[PDB]
Paper text:
Herein, we demonstrate the inhibitory activity of taniborbactam against PenI, the class A β-lactamase produced by B. pseudomallei. PenI was found to be an extended-spectrum β-lactamase (ESBL). Taniborbactam is a boronic acid β-lactamase inhibitor with a broad spectrum of activity that covers not only class A, C, and D serine β-lactamases but also many class B metallo-β-lactamases, including NDM (except NDM-9 and NDM-30) and VIM (except VIM-83). In conclusion, we demonstrated that PenI, the main mechanism of resistance to β-lactams in the pathogen B. pseudomallei, is effectively overcome by potent inhibition by taniborbactam.
The PenI–taniborbactam complex structure was solved in space group P21 at 1.25 Å resolution. The tail end of taniborbactam could not be resolved, as poor electron density was observed for the 2Fo-Fc map at 1.0 σ and the polder map (omit map) at 2.5 σ in this region; thus, the atom occupancies were set to 0.3. The high resolution of the active site allowed detection of the boron of taniborbactam bound to Ser70, as well as other direct hydrogen-bonding interactions of taniborbactam with residues Ser130, Asn132, Thr235, and Thr237 and water-bridged hydrogen-bonding interactions with Glu166 and Thr216. Therefore, the overall binding mode was like that observed in the KPC-2 structure in complex with taniborbactam, with some differences. For instance, the orientation of Tyr105 in PenI was different from that of Trp105 in the KPC-2/taniborbactam complex. In PenI, Tyr105 limited the freedom of taniborbactam to have alternate conformations. Also, in the PenI–taniborbactam complex, a disulfide bond between Cys77 and Cys123 as well as free thiols was observed with the ratio between the two at approximately 1:1. Of note, in the apo-PenI structure, only the free thiols were observed; thus, a disulfide bond appears to have formed upon complexing with taniborbactam. As the disulfide bond was not observed in the apo-PenI structure, we hypothesize that the binding of taniborbactam induces a conformational change that slightly shortens the distance between the Cys residues, allowing the formation of the disulfide bond. Thus, it is likely that the binding of taniborbactam by PenI led to the formation of the disulfide bond between Cys77 and Cys123, which would increase the stability of the PenI–taniborbactam complex and the residence time for the presence of taniborbactam in the complex.
Residue numbers in the entry: 26 to 238, 240 to 252, 254 to 291
Write the structure that this text describes.
């Protein structure tokens, strides 16, 4: 019951002093549950999905690109870089940097990949090329996570991100090999156990990318793969009014459960 689910999302939002942006889409029927679907939210590290999709797209035209070694420096290292800091001095391949940024939310890896592509504007241009007129990447890590009230930098809408996740992981925005690699990376994410993954039935597989930012911002985007039915896209953006808010996992899990029940 889409209308019942949307009411429950409104009730969930009433429990905290912030905003919930949500879209769930059953890709077979197009059944769609949304809350604040056309409002902008700070996407934080969920942008790393669009970044790596852009890298994969480049690799379709440069066969050796994913195996190229990037010999980055200690001076490139910034906070929340659990893979790149361990391997500095040996370097990492482009594929390994994508895996790190997607599965561990590695910030240095994202900056290296942004630089490889030519800057944050190339990620925005990639989004436009797949039909997303809304996503905008304005800054690099870590400043893209400031999540300031009313700031449109480094934002998208839940609706635009739902369409982009659909086209990238389920549809044909990427070639088959690139779609499979993006899925494989996101299926292996390590940072989302308490978010979308905590709100779905035990037999659903999940490909997701989380984000956490200032103003208690807590996001998760991805696709659930139930057995014997089509994939379901889940987009969850949350951001709080208190600059001193502590980011939570439980609102995302609760919003996910609402939609999972509706799509039972
Ligand atoms: B990013 O948004 O992804 C990310 C997550 C995530 O995937 O949920 C968790 C932890 C770090 C990161 C890196 C990216 N975010 C930031 O760099 C901003 C940073 C995240 C940690 C917060 N810590 C507050 C005090 N416990 C503050 C902002």
């Amino acid at each position: 019951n889409v209308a019942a689910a949307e009411r429950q999302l409104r009730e969930l939002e009433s429990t905290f002093d912030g905003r919930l942006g949500f879209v769930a889409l059953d890709t077979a029927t197009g059944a769609r549950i949304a809350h604040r679907g056309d409002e902008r939210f700070p996407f934080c590290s969920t942008s790393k999905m669009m970044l790596c999709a852009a890298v994969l797209a480049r690799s379709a035209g440069e066969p050796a690109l994913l195996q190229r070694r990037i010999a980055y420096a200690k001076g490139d290292l910034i906070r929340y870089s659990p893979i790149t800091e361990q391997h500095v001095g040996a370097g990492m391949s482009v594929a390994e940097l994508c895996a790190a940024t997607l599965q561990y939310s590695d910030n240095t890896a994202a900056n290296l990949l942004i630089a490889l592509l030519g800057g944050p504007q190339t990620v925005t241009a990639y989004a436009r090329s797949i039909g997303d007129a809304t996503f905008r990447l304005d800054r690099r890590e870590p400043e893209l996570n400031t999540a300031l009230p009313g700031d449109e930098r480094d934002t998208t809408t839940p609706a635009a991100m739902a369409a982009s996740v659909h086209r990238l992981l389920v549809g044909d925005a990427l070639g088959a090999a690139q779609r499979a690699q993006l899925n494989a990376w996101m299926l292996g994410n390590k940072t989302g156990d308490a978010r979308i993954r905590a709100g779905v039935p035990a037999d659903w597989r999940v490909a997701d990318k989380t984000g956490t930012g200032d103003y208690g911002t807590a996001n998760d985007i991805g696709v659930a793969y139930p057995p014997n039915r089509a994939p379901i896209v889940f987009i969850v953006y949350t951001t709080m009014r208190n600059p001193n808010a502590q980011a939570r996992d439980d609102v995302i899990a609760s919003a996910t459960r609402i939609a999972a029940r509706a799509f039972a």
